[PDB]
């Protein structure tokens, strides 16, 4: 975006040229600068900005493509006053804080906010913590300097979000005093001192003086935001059976197929084929007639759920990951046989996308060129190649040796099992894999397919018994590493070509001293030897050997690494013996898999799976409507509410159940995104919903009440001060009462309190149909005034006429047009109207002002003109006119003593009968989006209310609890509980702490060996303490068990322990040869030992704990080079977390690819990281991962 | 100087104008001030 200071600079240069002076010779003054729009500089091309000056009026105007962009007033400064640039009195006389933000931290904070400034705009050398005074650079560029001024001004604002300048009351520039003020540091760099005075709304530095700067929140909505890949790190046995048993549709399909088979109906292709086969004849069915039939000639059998059920199940992903893992290289070569019918080419490439560094060379082969001729576009979109090899014959040299083979024999027909397997194993490289999908004979579905397809013997041959397949594998000297089996007899074979037998090394890796590193370091050094090196740990289930091998394999010589781990999550589970003579070790050796993990009577390895896309939901009593995507009504959905944790004792609390909640224009503007949430007065969390202003429901005591709330009133419960509650009259209905509060309260405040309306006066009430208009009309007629009202349409006119008989046909006008001015002036004899209640647009507003009579009073309740700061000719005040700015939002913040006046007025109106409920259209809670759309259309008359809960016949109900309801899950914390973040003063720790506080923690303990030693840390800590949070700094190591106990105890003082997070990390990078046992001890001490100490102490004395999060890294699992110790520590942490959950205790381990704001994966922005952390916290899996693919 | 006076106002403030120069000249007045609850009064004893 083009900086506003850029506009100022170009205007200044234009004025200097017009006067003939040079820029540095011309002290200029700006006034009433206004930025109507922001210009976006394109990457390629140029944008022309045109500046026109009106010398007579001292006005300028910048335009682009004939569109106004900037306007204001500019003129030469006749008599510069050096007194002007003297630094103002400091708002805080004595900060007395040696700490101060440096350049890096300043722009780190600004990046967190959303500002991304490059080197040329990084002009702030330092800034005081409060952000009031600092030092700026002077690179001889004016635009950079003034933009740095604006940056300094923005740095102090507590409000979050992205704010940009919109108006500047006045700017003074004096190059001479600027040159005088500049002074040099020790370096040759030139600097100037800046001072910001929020009290006087003035920013002064060098020879510049900005006053009255006004910044307006930007939407801050960027398209094409990063989309992280979410996965769950789950254990996976090598062999499984009944994989798809959970699915019902598959079972129903099986029932249908067997039913047709019985005695020799659905949309699925296979049941349709069976029905066709049985249709022609009940007995003696022709093989030809059943083989061919319309709606079956297509290769839609694979599309049948039964046949391709396993492929859709994760088993395919597990097998593919297993194949990829045991690759000496980082590149994979895969070939598909009979691809025309297999169609795996359309599926396999998609599954391997998550791997960041993997490079794939896929090639599809078929018996005949015409087969697979179709879908050539599908092949083209992927990196695949055509093929002609027919498996029966020996493989062509072109394919040669490939890492992996995929067959999909279940649908494709194989000429002969033995011959095809021989050809394949010939094609398969040494140590490669053969993925084979087939249907097992002797199973119900197997027998059913055997009865069918008898016409083609080749397919019949493909169907074989499980033991037959196993025997076939042995004959071709192929070893079955793993097997996946469906519940209906389908299966998925994964076989590996044996590698030349070699004597394997054995190295215990369970020593706590890490001295085994030297032993391993020596062995790997002997790169000449090709003997595989088998690391095996059996002493501890928490050994993180998995991460170690994952990292080591990348480093040179890592090809020889192979792991064997025994981790049982149940003590009762026995431990197999891994002695060389023991059978199990020999079996795993024959398999020759990199990862061999045994857990509770099963051999397997950890795998990555994409987790469910759906957002978790739970049944809750407290939930509030929210828009998950700002500006989209389609996203409106219910979310869990923080009200679950609340104190009923407090008299100010007065928690109330919600039955009907109304919608107002403000709610639509918020949902539509036309109104920024920050525009709502008050201190609001960044993540929250500000929908709904009024409601009506039963109090905690059951008494029916209607209430008014600043926001969050559209929910199943509201926390409200009793001052904002009225008792519903016995004759009203809770639905009716849902409309009275806001409209009547604002009408009374506008007329009686401010306008001081007297009986017999004259009024002009715009938008009579609207709720506020109806309330105002009802109030006025009671006094006995004469009313003029404007209505958009004829039906609204008729409705108002019916509702208010006293009102007359001459009391109407047209609102959408500006013709009412003539009508009012004519029917009033030209005198005008005493009182005006205006809520219309700029031109309508100007028209209304002319309607005022002498001693008139203008009541303004709109916002558009006020926000835009449109001018108002003051000549109207020559009469005794009084202009009122009426905002009801002020009461919710202060002046409650004043608010009681309006409360009494509304109560008196209610009891006297003046107050009448408006017409209501009811939408059920589940249809809230429909209500929003209907009100957005603008055809509604009266109010739109959402029936959150139906009213009971009883007048007063003892238990007013809301009915349980299902909504999206969110994370909130009780106020009384205490939370601990180990190493919370790091880059991630502080951001996580802030995120938690926004969830209402109120009691925090941050651990760090060094303690507060940076300006940013001190700034954040003091900011939090100002909000009332009880922050604490420990400096107690979690590595030492005594240290962990002390940390927990001191945390308990603030209150019961709620959650503990382990973000402590010390890293010592370097290749294995460089690593030494000391570095491993140092790296694992805060992460491995600390986690064990925290687990022990928490399980000992933290009964109320519910959150136990341990931050791991993607390097573990995925693998990375030169970070073996890091991977080991992370893997150990993950193992501890996995064990904890098995016992019912809470525990979580998160793997982050990279953090940007504070291995082929781009750094992830902090906002996305926190969102994903919330989602993870709400999920039940033991370990989760997140990263952004390059 | 009139513009300077407007800025000094606080929320719920009231502005009482008794000078008749700017009013007669019909000089502009930014309406953004009214966002803060504010009542701009045009005082003229002459009416009585
Ligand atoms: N103290 C304060 O600052 C407060 C201010 N207010 C203001 O009161 C005003 C009136 O609110 P209220 O009458 O309850 O609003 P409603 O939406 O209930 O009524 C809107 C009225 O104005 C017109 N209108 C407004 N918005 C739309 C729209 N999106 N689509 C179609 N027609 C629309 C309608 O047509 P038509 O007019 O043509 O018949 C209708 O008469 C608002 O401007 C609000 O900001 C309210 C309370 C507090
Ligand atoms: N890209 C990333 O940053 C990624 C982060 N992670 C993990 O996420 C977490 C957050 O990392 P992040 O905060 O960015 O990194 P930091 O390096 O900033 O975290 C280390 C912090 O912990 C403190 N600390 C060190 N030892 C201890 C100890 N024994 N007890 C208490 N505090 C201690 C350090 O202070 P001091 O040195 O003075 O003790 C420092 O403040 C870490 O667990 C990290 O491993 C993993 C994946 C990606």
DSSP string covering A408-445, please?
-TTTS--S-HHHHHHHHHHHEEEEEEEEEEEEEETSHH
Distance from CA of A835 to the nearest CA of B (A): 14
Kindly state if the Cβ of A1127 falls inside 6 Å of ligand 2: no
**What is the rounded distance in angstroms from the CA atom of residue A578 to the CA atom of residue A582?**
6
Let me know: does A548 contact A1131? Beta carbons within 8 Å: yes
**What is the rounded distance in angstroms from the CA atom of residue A621 to the CA atom of residue A362?**
53
Report which of B23, B15, B29, B8 is spatially closest to residue A871, judged by C-alpha positions. B29
**What is the rounded distance in angstroms from the CA atom of residue A395 to the CA atom of residue A619?**
59
CB contact under 8 A, B35 and A867: yes
Let me know: does A997 contact A160? Beta carbons within 8 Å: no
**What is the rounded distance in angstroms from the CA atom of residue A919 to the CA atom of residue A935?**
14
Q: Which two tokens stand for residue B16?
A: 């009482």
Under DSSP, the state recorded for A978 is E
Q: Which two tokens stand for residue A470?
A: 């196993």
Torsion sign over Cα A419, A422, A424, A427: negative
The 3 state secondary structure assigned to A435-489 is EEEEEEECCHHHHHHHHCCCCCHHHHHHCEEHHHHHHHHHHCCCEEEEEEECCCC
Torsion sign over Cα B40, B42, B43, B48: negative
Kindly give, in sequence order, each residue whose CB lies less than 8 Å from that of residue A684, ignoring residues fewer than 6 positions away. A677, A678, A690, A711
Q: Which two tokens stand for residue A624?
A: 């509030």
CA A810, chain centre distance (Å)? 55
Residue A344's SS3 state is helix
Q: Which two tokens stand for residue A277?
A: 């086969």
Task: Name the residue among A874, A879, A887 with its Cβ closest to that of B22.
Answer: A874
**What is the rounded distance in angstroms from the CA atom of residue A590 to the CA atom of residue A604?**
15
CB contact under 8 A, A877 and B42: yes
Residue A1172's SS3 state is helix
Report which of A221, A1175, A54, A73 is spatially closest to residue A673, judged by C-alpha positions. A221
Distance from CA of B15 to the nearest CA of A (A): 10
**What is the rounded distance in angstroms from the CA atom of residue A40 to the CA atom of residue A47?**
9
Q: Which residue has the tokens 């109507």?
A: A36
Can you list the positions of beta strands (E) in A538-659?
Answer: 561-566, 597-598, 603-610, 617-620, 623-627, 636-640, 655-657
Torsion sign over Cα A444, A447, A451, A455: positive
Q: In this structure, which ligand is nearest to the CA of A1062? A: 2
Residues of B in contact with A868 (CB under 8 A): 32
Q: Which residue has the tokens 């403000």?
A: A666
**What is the rounded distance in angstroms from the CA atom of residue A439 to the CA atom of residue A442?**
10
Kindly give, in sequence order, each residue whose CB lies less than 8 Å from that of residue A787, ignoring residues fewer than 6 positions away. A762, A763, A764, A765, A777, A780, A781, A807, A811
Let me know: does A39 contact A26? Beta carbons within 8 Å: no
**What is the rounded distance in angstroms from the CA atom of residue A1002 to the CA atom of residue A817?**
54
Disruptive mutation site among B6, B15, B28, B32 for chain A (greatest number of A CBs within 10 Å): B32
- The string of DSSP codes covering A1029-1053 is -B--B----SSSHHHHHHHHHHHHH
Let me know: does A301 contact A269? Beta carbons within 8 Å: yes
**What is the rounded distance in angstroms from the CA atom of residue A482 to the CA atom of residue A239?**
6
Kindly state if the Cβ of A1156 falls inside 6 Å of ligand 2: no
Let me know: does A928 contact A946? Beta carbons within 8 Å: yes
Residues of B in contact with A885 (CB under 8 A): 33-39
Residues of A in contact with B8 (CB under 8 A): none
A349, with CB counted inside 10 A (0-12, 13-18, 19+), is: middle
**What is the rounded distance in angstroms from the CA atom of residue A879 to the CA atom of residue A725?**
41
A370, with CB counted inside 10 A (0-12, 13-18, 19+), is: exposed
Let me know: does A394 contact A425? Beta carbons within 8 Å: no
Q: Which residues pair with A216 in a beta bridge?
A: A164
Measured N-to-C along each axis, helices A987-998 and A1015-1026 cross at an angle, to the nearest 10 degrees, of 10
Distance from CA of A887 to the nearest CA of B (A): 6
Cβ count within 10 A of residue A788: 24
| Residues written for chain A | 1190
Q: Which residue has the tokens 């249809």?
A: A927
The percent helix, strand, coil of chain A (3-state, each to 5) is: 35, 25, 40
**What is the rounded distance in angstroms from the CA atom of residue A768 to the CA atom of residue A748?**
15
Task: Name the residue among B23, B25, B42 with its Cβ closest to that of A882.
Answer: B42
From which experimental method does this structure derive? cryo-EM
**What is the rounded distance in angstroms from the CA atom of residue A851 to the CA atom of residue A820?**
9
- CA angle A593-A598-A599, nearest 5°? 145
Residue A313's SS3 state is coil
Q: Which atom, in ligand 1's list, is nearest to the CA of A792? A: 38
Segment holding A1082, helix H or strand E: helix A1077-1084
Let me know: does A489 contact A443? Beta carbons within 8 Å: yes
Q: Which two tokens stand for residue A522?
A: 């020596």
Dihedral-angle region of residue A574 (phi above 0 means left; psi in -120 to 50 means alpha; beta otherwise): beta
CB contact under 8 A, B31 and A872: yes
Segment holding A134, helix H or strand E: strand A133-137
Let me know: does A968 contact A639? Beta carbons within 8 Å: yes
A1026, with CB counted inside 10 A (0-12, 13-18, 19+), is: exposed
Cβ count within 10 A of residue A913: 9
Kindly give, in sequence order, each residue whose CB lies less than 8 Å from that of residue A997, ignoring residues fewer than 6 positions away. A1004, A1024, A1027, A1029
Tell me the C-alpha to C-alpha distance, in Å, between residue A661 and each of A709, A719, A944.
11, 14, 9
Q: Output Rg (C-alpha) for chain A, integer angstroms.
A: 37
Residue nearest to atom 16 of ligand 1 (CA): A770
| Residues written for chain B | 48
Let me know: does A4 contact A36? Beta carbons within 8 Å: no
Residue A105's SS3 state is helix
Kindly give, in sequence order, each residue whose CB lies less than 8 Å from that of residue A1061, ignoring residues fewer than 6 positions away. A979, A980, A981, A982, A984, A992, A1107, A1109, A1110, A1111
Measured N-to-C along each axis, helices A314-325 and A305-312 cross at an angle, to the nearest 10 degrees, of 40
Segment holding A214, helix H or strand E: strand A208-217
Residue nearest to atom 27 of ligand 1 (CA): A938
Kindly state if the Cβ of A1113 falls inside 6 Å of ligand 2: yes
- How many helices and strands in chain A, by DSSP H and E? 37, 51
**What is the rounded distance in angstroms from the CA atom of residue A4 to the CA atom of residue A534?**
65
Under DSSP, the state recorded for A730 is T
Let me know: does A1132 contact A1084? Beta carbons within 8 Å: yes
Report which of A895, A893, A913, A946 is spatially closest to residue A694, judged by C-alpha positions. A946
Q: Which residues pair with A192 in a beta bridge?
A: A136
Distance from CA of A614 to the nearest CA of B (A): 43
Kindly state if the Cβ of A1044 falls inside 6 Å of ligand 2: no
What's the A770 CA to ligand 1 centre distance in angstroms?
5
Kindly state if the Cβ of A799 falls inside 6 Å of ligand 2: no
Let me know: does A1065 contact A986? Beta carbons within 8 Å: yes
Give phi and psi for A389, each to the nearest 5. -60, 130
Q: Cα torsion for A516, A517, A518, A521, to the nearest 10°?
A: 130
**What is the rounded distance in angstroms from the CA atom of residue A612 to the CA atom of residue A610?**
7
**What is the rounded distance in angstroms from the CA atom of residue A426 to the CA atom of residue A395?**
7
Give phi and psi for A125, each to the nearest 5. -75, -35
Q: Which two tokens stand for residue A262?
A: 């019985």
Q: Give chain B's contact residues with A (Cβ, < 8 Å).
A: 7, 11-12, 17, 20, 22-44, 47
The per-residue b/e assignment along A712-724, b for 16 or more CB within 10 angstroms, e otherwise, is bbbbbbbbbeeeb
Q: Which two tokens stand for residue A566?
A: 């025994």
Mutate to test the pocket of ligand 1, among A672, A770, A773 (most ligand atoms within 8 A of CB): A770
Q: Which two tokens stand for residue A1018?
A: 């001190």
Under DSSP, the state recorded for A1155 is B
Let me know: does A958 contact A703? Beta carbons within 8 Å: no
Termini Cα distance of chain A? 26
Let me know: does A431 contact A425? Beta carbons within 8 Å: no
Kindly give, in sequence order, each residue whose CB lies less than 8 Å from that of residue A778, ignoring residues fewer than 6 positions away. A744, A747, A804, A914, A915, A916
Mutate to test the pocket of ligand 2, among A1011, A1065, A1123 (most ligand atoms within 8 A of CB): A1065
CA A883, chain centre distance (Å)? 45
A764 is annotated as contributing to ligand binding:
yes
């Amino acid at each position: 975006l083009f900086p506003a200071t850029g506009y100022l600079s170009i205007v200044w240069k234009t004025l200097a040229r017009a006067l003939g002076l040079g820029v540095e010779q011309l002290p200029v003054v700006f006034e009433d600068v206004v930025l109507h729009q922001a210009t976006i500089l394109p990457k390629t091309g140029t944008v022309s900005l045109e500046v026109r000056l009106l010398e007579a009026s001292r006005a300028f105007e910048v335009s682009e493509n004939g569109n106004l962009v900037v306007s204001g007033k500019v003129y030469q400064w006749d008599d510069p006053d050096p007194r002007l640039f003297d630094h103002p009195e400091s708002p805080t006389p004595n900060p007395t804080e040696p700490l101060f933000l440096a350049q890096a931290e300043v722009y780190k904070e600004l990046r967190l906010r959303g500002y991304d400034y490059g080197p040329h705009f990084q002009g702030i050398l330092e800034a005081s913590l409060e952000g009031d005074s600092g030092r700026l650079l002077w690179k001889d560029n004016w635009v950079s300097f003034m933009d740095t001024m604006l940056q300094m001004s923005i740095l102090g604002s507590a409000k979050h979000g992205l704010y940009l300048p919109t108006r500047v009351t006045a700017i003074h520039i004096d190059p001479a005093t600027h040159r005088q003020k500049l002074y040099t540091l020790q370096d040759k760099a030139q600097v100037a001192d800046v001072v910001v005075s929020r009290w006087l709304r003035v920013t002064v530095a060098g020879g510049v003086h900005i006053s009255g700067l006004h910044t307006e929140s930007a939407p801050r909505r960027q398209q094409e935001q990063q989309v992280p890949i979410l996965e769950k790190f789950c254990f996976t046995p090598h062999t499984e059976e009944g994989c798809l048993s959970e699915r019902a549709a598959l079972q129903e399909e099986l029932q249908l197929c067997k039913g047709l088979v019985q005695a020799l109906p659905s949309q699925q292709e296979l049941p349709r084929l069976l029905s066709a086969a049985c249709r022609l004849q009940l007995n003696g069915n022709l093989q030809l007639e059943l083989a061919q039939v319309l709606a079956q000639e297509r290769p839609k059998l694979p599309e049948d759920p039964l046949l391709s059920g396993l492929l859709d199940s994760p088993a395919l992903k597990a097998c593919l990951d297993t194949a990829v893992e045991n690759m000496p290289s980082l590149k994979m070569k895969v070939v598909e046989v009979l691809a025309g019918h297999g169609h795996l080419y359309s599926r396999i490439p998609g599954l391997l996308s998550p791997h960041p560094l993997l490079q794939l060379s896929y090639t599809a082969t078929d018996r005949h060129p015409q087969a697979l001729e179709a879908a050539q576009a599908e092949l083209q979109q992927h990196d695949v190649a055509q093929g002609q090899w027919d498996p029966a014959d020996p493989a062509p040299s072109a394919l040669g040796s490939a890492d992996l083979l995929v067959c999909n024999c279940a649908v494709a027909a194989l000429g002969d099992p033995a011959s095809a397997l021989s050809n394949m194993v010939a094609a398969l490289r040494e140590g490669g894999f053969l993925l084979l999908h087939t249907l097992l004979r002797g199973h119900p579905l197997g027998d059913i397919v055997a009865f069918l397809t008898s016409t083609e013997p080749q397919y019949g041959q493909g169907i074989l018994s499980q033991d037959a397949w196993e025997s076939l594998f042995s004959r071709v000297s192929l070893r079955l590493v793993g097997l996946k089996k469906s519940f209906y007899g389908s299966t998925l074979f994964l076989c590996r070509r044996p590698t030349p037998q070699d004597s394997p090394i054995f190295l215990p890796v369970d020593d706590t001293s890490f001295r085994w590193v030297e032993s391993l370091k020596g062995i790997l050094a002997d790169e000449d030897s090709s003997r595989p090196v088998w690391l095996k740990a059996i002493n501890c289930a928490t050994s993180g050997v998995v991460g170690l091998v994952n990292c080591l394999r990348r480093e040179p010589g890592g090809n020889r690494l192979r792991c064997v781990l025994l981790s049982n999550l149940s003590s009762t589970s026995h431990v197999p013996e891994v002695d060389p003579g023991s059978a199990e070790l020999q079996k795993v050796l024959q398999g020759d898999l990199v990862m061999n993990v045994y857990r509770d009577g099963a051999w397997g390895a950890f795998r990555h799976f994409l987790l469910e896309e759906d957002k978790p939901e739970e049944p809750t009593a407290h939930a509030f409507v929210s828009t998950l995507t700002r500006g989209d009504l389609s996203s409106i959905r219910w979310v869990c509410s923080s009200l679950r944790h609340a104190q009923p004792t407090c008299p100010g609390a007065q928690l109330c159940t919600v039955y009907y909640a109304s919608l107002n224009f403000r709610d639509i503007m918020l949902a539509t995104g036309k109104l920024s949430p920050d525009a709502i007065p008050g201190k609001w969390t960044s993540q929250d919903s500000l929908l709904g202003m009024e409601f009506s429901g039963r109090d905690a005591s059951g008494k029916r009440v209607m209430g008014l709330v600043p926001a969050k009133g559209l929910a199943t419960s509201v926390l409200l001060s009793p001052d904002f509650l009225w008792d519903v009259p016995s004759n009203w209905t809770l639905e009716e009462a849902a409309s009275v509060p806001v409209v009547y309260s604002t009408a009374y405040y506008a007329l009686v309190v401010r306008g001081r309306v007297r009986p017999g006066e004259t009024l002009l009430i715009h938008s009579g149909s609207g709720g506020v208009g109806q309330a105002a009309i009802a109030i006025a007629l009671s006094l006995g005034c004469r009313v003029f009202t404007t209505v958009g349409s004829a039906e609204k006119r008729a409705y108002l006429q019916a509702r208010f008989p006293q009102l007359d046909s001459t009391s109407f006008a047209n609102s959408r047009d500006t013709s009412f001015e003539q009508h009012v002036l004519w029917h009033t004899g030209g005198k005008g109207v005493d009182l005006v209640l205006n809520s219309l647009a700029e031109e309508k507003l100007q028209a209304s002002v002319r309607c005022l009579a002498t001693h008139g009073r203008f009541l303004e309740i709109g916002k558009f003109d006020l926000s835009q700061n449109h001018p108002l000719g003051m000549a109207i005040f020559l009469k005794n006119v009084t202009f009122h700015g009426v905002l009801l939002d002020a009461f919710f913040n202060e002046s409650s003593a004043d608010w009681r006046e309006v409360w009494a007025l509304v109560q008196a109106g209610i009891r006297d009968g003046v107050v009448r409920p408006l017409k209501c259209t009811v939408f059920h809670g589940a249809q809230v989006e429909d209500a929003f759309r209907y009100m957005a259309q603008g055809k509604h008359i009266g109010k739109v209310v959402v029936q959150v809960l139906a009213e009971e016949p009883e007048a007063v109900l003892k238990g007013a609890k809301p009915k349980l309801m299902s909504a999206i899950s969110k994370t909130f914390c009780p106020a009384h509980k205490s939370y601990i973040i180990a190493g919370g003063l790091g880059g991630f720790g502080l951001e996580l702490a802030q995120w938690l506080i926004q969830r209402g923690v109120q009691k925090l303990v941050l651990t760090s060996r060094s303690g507060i030693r940076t300006g940013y840390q001190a700034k954040q800590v003091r900011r939090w303490r100002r909000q009332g949070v009880q922050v604490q700094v420990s400096t107690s190591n979690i590595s030492s068990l005594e240290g962990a106990r002390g940390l927990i105890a001191e945390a308990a003082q603030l209150g019961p322990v709620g959650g503990v997070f382990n973000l402590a990390v010390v890293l010592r990078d370097g290749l294995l040869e460089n690593q030494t046992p000391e570095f491993f001890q140092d790296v694992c001490k805060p992460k491995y030992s600390g986690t064990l100490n925290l687990d022990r102490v928490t399980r000992e004395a933290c009964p109320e704990l519910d959150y136990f999060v341990v931050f791991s890294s993607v390097s573990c699992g995925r693998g990375n080079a030169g970070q073996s110790n890091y991977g080991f520590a992370n893997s150990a942490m993950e193992r501890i977390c996995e064990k904890r959950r098995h016992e019912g205790l809470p525990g979580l381990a998160v793997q982050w690819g990279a953090i940007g704001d504070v291995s082929g994966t781009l750094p992830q922005r902090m906002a996305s990281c926190l969102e994903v952390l919330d989602l993870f916290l709400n999920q039940p899996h033991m370990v989760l991962s997140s990263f952004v693919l390059a």
